[PDB]
């Protein structure tokens, strides 16, 4: 089969910004009760507020409470 | 009214400021960016058909300062055309500025600037990996719900010049025809399994023959023979995807039949990776531009 794309043999490199990229990790700070409350919050949001096309309602992702 | 030029100017002006400087958009401005971009997404196909020249970028994860650096190197829109592969928010310091600039550029240059959906552009993931909390800190939960409506309308994949298939994650055992992508209706959530899940979640694995289990707890891995068979069936030359940190910002798989792009250098200050973008010229020559300085993969089921 005939291939159309090709790749350059030389990459350009430049220096990235030098700054502190560390960010908060809130997903490591969830108690069991917090997780239950979030599952409930997501389920209620998706069942009462979030618009989904009829033909895609079978894709909406619910969590076991 | 959306004063789009004012929003863009204010987002770009921090380029000369200390790293991490926030941009003071109003709630109504951000809601306008979400509503107008959503309308544009819905007016364009869910499977984008794009033409080179194009610059293709992988995950950004709220590294706004790095996004500005990437645009400085590649050319600020509309000097170059862009396709981003998803994962704009979460797991970084400035998801809001990042997504706001991307949405503003989509509205300003709707035929020259393109955003695909990543697995972090859905409620169940960005509820917990940082974006909801960032929205709550700076604005309110209702604004997070407005972003969710916009993300639910993003396109899912793109084909560049009938030869490069682009998506965030990867291939799917359910993907037999491109029509199956085109039949997905928006707005939609990302399911826990099936075609749309796999397009946003799957990964290549050199040690897998065929399809395998994915240790993220969702979707699949796929081997080099799956890539080769897919490209042959669809008369494609390359799969271009993102979704994994790679040391050089780009990494080939399956004798250069697949490439992974990752555009957030020094990811979340914990990894020593570069960030890259792939430029495709009008003759379909692909080249890389790099910005060089596990625990990194997101997972499903953290709530369960
Ligand atoms: Mn990512
Ligand atoms: Mn991802």
Numbering used by the authors:
A (entry chain C): 516 to 580
B (entry chain A): 6 to 298, 325 to 335
Copy text verbatim from the article accompanying this structure deposition.
Fusion proteins comprising PP1(7–304) joined via a (SG)9 linker to unphosphorylated substrate sequences were coexpressed with Phactr1(516-580) for structural analysis. This approach allowed determination of the structures of the IRSp53(449-465) and spectrin αII (1025–1039) complexes at 1.09 Å and 1.30 Å resolution, respectively (referred to hereafter as the IRSp53 and spectrin complexes), but was unsuccessful with Tbc1d15, Plekho2, afadin, and cofilin. The Phactr1/PP1-IRSp53 and Phactr1/PP1-spectrin complexes crystallised in the same spacegroup. The substrate sequences, whose N-termini are largely unresolved, make extensive contacts across the PP1 catalytic site, then extend in a sinuous trajectory across the composite Phactr1/PP1 surface, making numerous hydrophobic and ionic contacts. Like the Phactr1/PP1 holoenzyme, the complexes contain a presumed phosphate anion at the catalytic site, and thus appear to represent putative enzyme/product complexes (see below). IRSp53 and spectrin make virtually identical contacts with the PP1 catalytic cleft, predominantly via their mainchains. In both structures, the residues +3 to +6 form a β-turn, allowing the hydrophobic doublet L459-L460IRSp53/L1035-L1036spectrin (+4/+5) to make intimate contact with the Phactr1/PP1 hydrophobic pocket, entirely burying the +5 leucine sidechain. These interactions are stabilised by hydrogen bonds between the mainchain carbonyls of substrate residues +2, +4, +5 and Phactr1 R576 K550, and R554, and between the sidechain of the substrate acidic +6 residue (D461IRSp53/E1037spectrin) and Phactr1 H578; a hydrogen bond between the D461IRSp53 mainchain carbonyl and Phactr1 R579 is substituted by a hydrogen bond between the E1037spectrin carboxylate and Phactr1 R579 mainchain amide. At position +2 (G457IRSp53/E1033spectrin), the mainchain amide and carbonyl make hydrogen bonds with the mainchain carbonyls of PP1 R221 and Phactr1 R576 respectively; in addition, the E1033spectrin side chain spans the top of the amphipathic cavity to make an additional salt bridge with the Phactr1 R576 side chain. The most striking aspect of substrate recognition is the role played by the composite surface generated by the close apposition of the Phactr1 extreme C-terminal sequences and the PP1 hydrophobic groove.
The three Protein Phosphatase 1 (PP1) isoforms regulate diverse cellular processes, acting in partnership with over 200 different PP1-interacting proteins (PIPs). The four Phosphatase and actin regulator (Phactr) proteins are novel PIPs that are implicated in cytoskeletal regulation in animal models and cell culture settings. Here, we show that Phactr1 confers sequence-specificity on the Phactr1/PP1 holoenzyme. We show that efficient catalysis requires interactions between conserved hydrophobic residues in the substrate and a novel Phactr1-PP1 composite surface, which comprises a hydrophobic pocket and associated amphipathic cavity with a surrounding basic rim.
